[PDB]
Amino acid sequence: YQEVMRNLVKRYVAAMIREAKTEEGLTEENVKELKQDISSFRFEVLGLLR
Amino acid sequence: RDRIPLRIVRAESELSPSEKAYLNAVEKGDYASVKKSLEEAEIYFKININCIDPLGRTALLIAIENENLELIELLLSFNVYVGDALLHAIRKEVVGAVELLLNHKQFSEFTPDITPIILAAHTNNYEIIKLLVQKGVSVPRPHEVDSLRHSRSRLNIYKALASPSLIALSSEDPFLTAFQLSWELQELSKVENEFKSEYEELSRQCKQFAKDLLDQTRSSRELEIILNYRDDLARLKLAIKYRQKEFVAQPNCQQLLASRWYDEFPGWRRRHWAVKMVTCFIIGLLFPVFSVCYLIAPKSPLGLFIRKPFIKFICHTASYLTFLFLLLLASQHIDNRQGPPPTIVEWMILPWVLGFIWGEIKQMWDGGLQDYIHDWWNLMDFVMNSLYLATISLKIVAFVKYSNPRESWDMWHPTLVAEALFAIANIFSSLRLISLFTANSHLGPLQISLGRMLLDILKFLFIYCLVLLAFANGLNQLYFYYEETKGLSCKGIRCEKQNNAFSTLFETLQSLFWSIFGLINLYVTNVKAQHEFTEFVGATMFGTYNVISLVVLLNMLIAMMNNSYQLIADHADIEWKFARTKLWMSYFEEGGTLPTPFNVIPSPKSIGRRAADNLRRHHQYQEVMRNLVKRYVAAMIREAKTEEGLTEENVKELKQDISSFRFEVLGLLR
Amino acid sequence: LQISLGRMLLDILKFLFIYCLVLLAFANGLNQLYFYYEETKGLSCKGIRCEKQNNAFSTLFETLQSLFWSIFGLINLYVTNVKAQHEFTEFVGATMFGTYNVISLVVLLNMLIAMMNNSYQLIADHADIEWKFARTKLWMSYFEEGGTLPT
Amino acid sequence: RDRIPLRIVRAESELSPSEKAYLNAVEKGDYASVKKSLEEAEIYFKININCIDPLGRTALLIAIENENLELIELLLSFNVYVGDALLHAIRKEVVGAVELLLNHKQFSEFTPDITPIILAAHTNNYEIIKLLVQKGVSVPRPHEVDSLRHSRSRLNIYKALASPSLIALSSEDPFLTAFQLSWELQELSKVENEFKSEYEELSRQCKQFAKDLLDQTRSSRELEIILNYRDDLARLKLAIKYRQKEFVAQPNCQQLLASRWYDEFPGWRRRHWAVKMVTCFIIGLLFPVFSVCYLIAPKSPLGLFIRKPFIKFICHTASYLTFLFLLLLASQHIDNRQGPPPTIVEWMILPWVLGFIWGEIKQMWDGGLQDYIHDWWNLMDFVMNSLYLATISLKIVAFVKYSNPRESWDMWHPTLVAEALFAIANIFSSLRLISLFTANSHLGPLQISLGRMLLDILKFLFIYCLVLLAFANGLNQLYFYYEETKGLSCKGIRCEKQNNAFSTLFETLQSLFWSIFGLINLYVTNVKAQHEFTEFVGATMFGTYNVISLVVLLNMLIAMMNNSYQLIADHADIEWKFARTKLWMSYFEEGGTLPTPFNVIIGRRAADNLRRHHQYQEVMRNLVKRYVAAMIREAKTEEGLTEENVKELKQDISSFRFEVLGLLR
Amino acid sequence: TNNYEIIKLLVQKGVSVPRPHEVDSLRHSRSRLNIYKALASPSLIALSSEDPFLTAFQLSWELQELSKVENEFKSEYEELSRQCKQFAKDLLDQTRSSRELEIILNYRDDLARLKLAIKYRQKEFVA
Ligand SMILES: CCCCCCCCCCCCCCCC(=O)OC[C@H](COP(=O)(O)O)OC(=O)CCCCCCCCCCCCCCC
Ligand SMILES: CCCCCCCCCCCCCCCC(=O)OC[C@H](COP(=O)(O)O)OC(=O)CCCCCCCCCCCCCCC
Ligand SMILES: CCCCCCCCCCCCCCCC(=O)OC[C@H](COP(=O)(O)O)OC(=O)CCCCCCCCCCCCCCC
Ligand SMILES: CC(C)CCC[C@@H](C)[C@H]1CC[C@H]2[C@@H]3CC=C4C[C@@H](OC(=O)CCC(=O)O)CC[C@]4(C)[C@H]3CC[C@]12C
Ligand SMILES: CC(C)CCC[C@@H](C)[C@H]1CC[C@H]2[C@@H]3CC=C4C[C@@H](OC(=O)CCC(=O)O)CC[C@]4(C)[C@H]3CC[C@]12C
Ligand code: NA
Ligand code: NA
Ligand code: NA
């Protein structure tokens, strides 16, 4: 029974972590991530050319 | 104790920290660090290439989940354990699955029945399905001669075949595939009580796909090629046959059905409604005039004028109406144990009734008895015309072997049974005008919504019949001793005094049934003897019957019809129009057309061309379906964009497209 | 269907307590107004459950029977007469019986209809996952052995 | 003709193409091309700096809409016509408005009443409001001594004051500001039939803000400082006074109200319900025992035991119940034109009735008559106890000046009127047990949902009363000639024969009203004479009355109560709990407490005011701090990205592009 | 927050949760609701439980019968008990290939797990 529950908890956690993606809604803070990933990268490349 | 300890009960190794740095080199987009840490292999201490996280992620799943094709080319350049990372490249609709196709107990996340083309069809992506069909692939057929795999795998096969892209591709015509699949999925959902809401979902998907292929039909004649394709209007007959209620009312199909119903009235559907009432009134008045023609000269203006199917309806219904006015007129006449055929009225009746019987036998020749007994109005015609046969048979049997008491009759004397069955057949005959409502646009959807609440009422009256049997057994059991007064007529109930109400079981059923309404009084539950306890217990039983039947159950029936009528009125006007095209399309065929008395009588008063046409119609229809499948696939792939919802993994794409690019530019400046 | 009705029963039984307080209210009123002016102990039959319906609001128990049967159309208007000639107590007793009929038959009973509409819409969402639970209770009452011998 | 031509009817200049290239140099993020095309000015052929698109866009609005601060610094470095691009930097919640604050008929997009702090409060952004309050700013007061500007500007002022960030900042205590603003916006929505759904929206916003400030209360004693702040439980009395139905049921407030209602039963709310019925039964049975104490010794175990407000309820209601059992027992006794005080039963009654009258006058001393006549059960107590005064007054008047006919009385003889009013007062007295349901958790919300459908029923019975007047005028007008049989009693209706039904108007109203039910038969509409036409027209009038009243109107009343009960049952359990804390909180005060028959028979002030005042302001500093942090956290998780967020990222890639290409080329 | 990865990152270090039972008042009910809100999450039942079906069933029982105790916070403990009642149904949804189902529905510590599931009124586990 613990081996069967190892299988079920394994594929269940994989299933819900798959379903955390398809929520059809992006909070604004996701934009706060991408906007920094362009910004900090900018302040690295301008640190190498200047 | 005081705390509770938390230990990982189900634990793997998990990983080496160098391997954790290798999986941290992916998920960031490092084309440099992954290439170094992969070239450190074949030493090969100590990182294995095929390393697996505590949560899946076999090191090539990360290159797909974070959608990066260069790391897929780098990992497939080496020997990464692929199986089964092709399937993971299908859920995300990555079209890097080309690289998993053209090139190169372990916890599969998928049920092992899943082939690539089944999960390709589940995701409904047209491009990946076309990428697989160009290589293989085969789907197993579902039929047969330990149990979760069988129903699950059968539902994955039917779930894959019902997708509108393996019906767009890989089908001779997608209308037969959508119709027959919707039939097999509906009748398969009836078989398995389990998984009912999933096979109904797939049959609804197939029923919507055909409607959307009709939505892609521009420019009739492209519509008429579809709705005539015999392998008349054969595709609409075959569409009504498979109960495709959304295929009909395309609304492009209702213009073809509507113009063919009106052919060729110049602008009849634009006139004033009272002018429509006058024209339907005077065309309805001239129903012997148009219908003596088509017997004199079927090639004539009037003989071609009754071939108009709107002129068939009014006036089949006008002839039916004069039959009903004549049944009004039957009970206003003359008012003998053996009669004539009485009166002159019934001498006028006999061709109408023989016309309805010939109409029902003639209707059972072409079709039935499954499609005949499917509709309820035809069953009602069987009961009506059967009571007409019983009535005229007991009138003829009454004319023979009888001759004269005024009223002191046998009480089963065949004149009385003939009159009673004749009256019941007049109720069933004059309730047929409710079925004439589906032609009207205002009285139409109303009638069909009531007809769909009837099946939810009939499930409820069975419970009420058990309450009648319950309180009837109680009250009969309590009153068959204390109540039997056989000394004077009248007997009760249907009586001015209401004497013996709960004596027999049949009179008790009548007493409770009429006590639904306020038609049975309280002095009913007295005893002629003096027993106040049995009178009070009988009256309390009658009171709890009135509470359970009139306060509890009848208002539960009201609530049930509220919830049913709210579910029905969503799908009205796409289910009214289906029954309207059944009624319309019952008048398109020829002969057929002679209103009820004139159906049998001379009128009563009282070869390589077959292969050429098959290849011409066949290649013509396949060319039209090439156009429709082309613009339909373009339409749905357009509608996959405007979903107004971005999943989080889209951010997982852009965030890598900035990240990996970063680790390229820093690779060129440093 | 049966289980949705069985789940509306507990919302009905919360409602009949209010109605029982309306019966106690108008029963105390009508008994209090008619125990003087109405007591005819000279002839059987007594009323109610009677062809003449003689003494309806005399005692409290007969008043509860009179109002309860007057939910339905089974108790007539000549019930609220007095053998003596007092038109004011007859009119006040008939107005009390009229407001009883309005509160019970127009106000409360249609509020019970509305209550069962809102309850049956909440119940029918969770039907077929609550029918199947009671079906596996009924199924699983027959899995065990001995047990099995019909009554 | 055959076509229809389409010409721009409303046309500006529009622009020069060089100016179109200048506005195309912005909206792409060009820090180089904008700087060149701005340094080409003061030549100054031919681009003006203040150039305006066909769709607004005064060349600095583009630097805000596409959120770029370097072009705002570049344009504000030169002389761009700013007014009013500060306001456009507030809708988008750009915190580059600092640069429009610290530094530097023309189609304003905004109504000219809009100041920066009003539109700052409309967008509810805490940071921009704090950036403006540090500079000015003042809001006009709304009251007064051509007409769209007045109501629109008043609604913008109230719309700005009702925002939960000019109540978080800029208020002495935000609970009084939320309560008084919710009152002024509700009672202001009643004044103006127009704009009703907007002032109701703002009052709902104020009523939610106070509930969310209670949601930020952790760790009582922080709650009890709030709910005791007298400028008892003064803030809950003031919260019930302003009908803050969501403030109550915080649900943190129901624990404070619930423990104070139970003080101090060890775990009463965990026991079995039948054990609760036994304890309430035997405590309800001993109501003279606990209530003779607090008259003997109010400092005693039993004298402090009736000070428990749950022990006040049961047993005020137990004393009320023995009054009702005794009214059951009144009609089972002895069964004279002049009586005693009859019987011994009423000799027992008089202290209960004088107790209720003293309870209602005592209730009208502390409060009312607005808050007294607001609740309907108190009005019902006024009618009940008034009929008790009329009853005992006609019994005393009956004892004097009378002495003996058995039944042949005056028909307005005061014994009969005393008995009739006594019976009506027993109906109104024993319908009070329905008001005892709000203490119960199962019978509670049901009673209040019915009580909220009553006001929608009473709007409907006015239409029905007009249908009664209509068909009553018709049927009386048709039958006052052909029907008047004054030759034999009984008269009809309330009669075995039902003789004269439509003779007079009052009997016609009785005939139609009883013909709602199946209590009036068809032979009612006959004439003693032989006129079949007037009998058929009278019967058709009675038939259309039965169709309009019993098929049309009564099922419309059913449908009306369906739509009303679906709207009511959403806001149940936050409106049951409000009336439950009214009922609970009617028993918290002292004296007060004696069940119905037994009711009659200095610098330290400045130190306590500064201590309570600074303590409460410290607690409100904590709550406003963590509340503003909470709502600014909830501004993120909205699950919806507007398109203009894409207009930000797309510029952050674009302008960066036009910087890197400026360094490699 | 129900994130499986961060919970596994913490369980590898400590951590302990206090037990809820007992022998000024907002902290007690709030902290008890945070403890039951943490134990009812489907990732501290996925990790850190002997079998998650008994933990989901017994937690759904204690949260339902705990929502009956406290009239306040009723709609939050009912929400958590509904969360536990859904977690068990989703673990049955992850069962492929009976015999994997019959091992679950027979585990006596007949069909003992269905009798124990009907006993705890798990109406969604069944069906
Ligand atoms: C059981 C399957 C069907 C569905 C389940 C039904 C739920 C259970 C039904 C409850 C039983 C009915 C009550 C008992 C009948 C009865 O008392 O009838 C028995 C008698 C009625 O008069 P008799 O005694 O003269 O017969 O009760 C009395 O003696 C008079 C006092 C009782 C007053 C009844 C109060 C109950 C309220 C019912 C009316 C509600 C009206 C709604 C409008 C506001
Ligand atoms: C109180 C807790 C329960 C819920 C609260 C109930 C709300 C209050 C109920 C209002 C009181 C009832 C009205 C008074 C009864 C009465 O008049 O009854 C008293 C008498 C009735 O005839 P008698 O006088 O002969 O008794 O009124 C009359 O004299 C005749 C003229 C009155 C016409 C009544 C008009 C009121 C409309 C009620 C019928 C609505 C039918 C709905 C279908 C369209
Ligand atoms: C007007 C403001 C109020 C709201 C508006 C009301 C809408 C208009 C009402 C329509 C008028 C009522 C119909 C006329 C009454 C009448 O005919 O009553 C008049 C008589 C009734 O019998 P008498 O003739 O003996 O009086 O009609 C007849 O002669 C018998 C044949 C007529 C059959 C009536 C058919 C109408 C259907 C009404 C019953 C519906 C039952 C619903 C359950 C299925
Ligand atoms: C028993 C005798 C006394 C007849 C009494 C009934 C008739 C007066 C009514 C009842 C139903 C009515 C019918 C209801 C519906 C229709 C369909 C309707 O036909 C249409 O809507 C035309 C089609 C279109 O509108 O495109 C009008 C005729 C008809 C037969 C109506 C004709 C008159 C009918 C038979
Ligand atoms: C069933 C018919 C015959 C009516 C019976 C009349 C009385 C015996 C009933 C009518 C209303 C009942 C009351 C309805 C509501 C309440 C509130 C309820 O009090 C509580 O719920 C305690 C508060 C809490 O539970 O926290 C129980 C007592 C009481 C007065 C009940 C006491 C018994 C009463 C008076
Ligand atoms: Na037929
Ligand atoms: Na009736
Ligand atoms: Na009071």
Residue numbers in the entry:
A (entry chain B): 706 to 755
B (entry chain A): 15 to 118, 134 to 174, 188 to 273, 285 to 388, 393 to 460, 463 to 665, 692 to 755
C (entry chain B): 505 to 655
D (entry chain C): 15 to 118, 134 to 174, 188 to 273, 285 to 388, 393 to 460, 463 to 660, 692 to 755
E (entry chain B): 152 to 174, 188 to 273, 285 to 302
Sentences from the paper on this structure:
The TRPC subfamily are non-selective cation channels (Na+, K+, Ca2+) that alter proliferation, vascular tone, and synaptic plasticity. TRPC4 is broadly expressed in human tissues and can assemble as homomeric channels or form heteromeric channels with TRPC1 and TRPC54–7. Activation of TRPC4 is regulated by intracellular Ca2+, phospholipase C, and membrane lipids by unclear mechanisms. TRPC4 has been characterized as a non-selective cation channel with moderate selectivity for Ca2+ over monovalent cations.
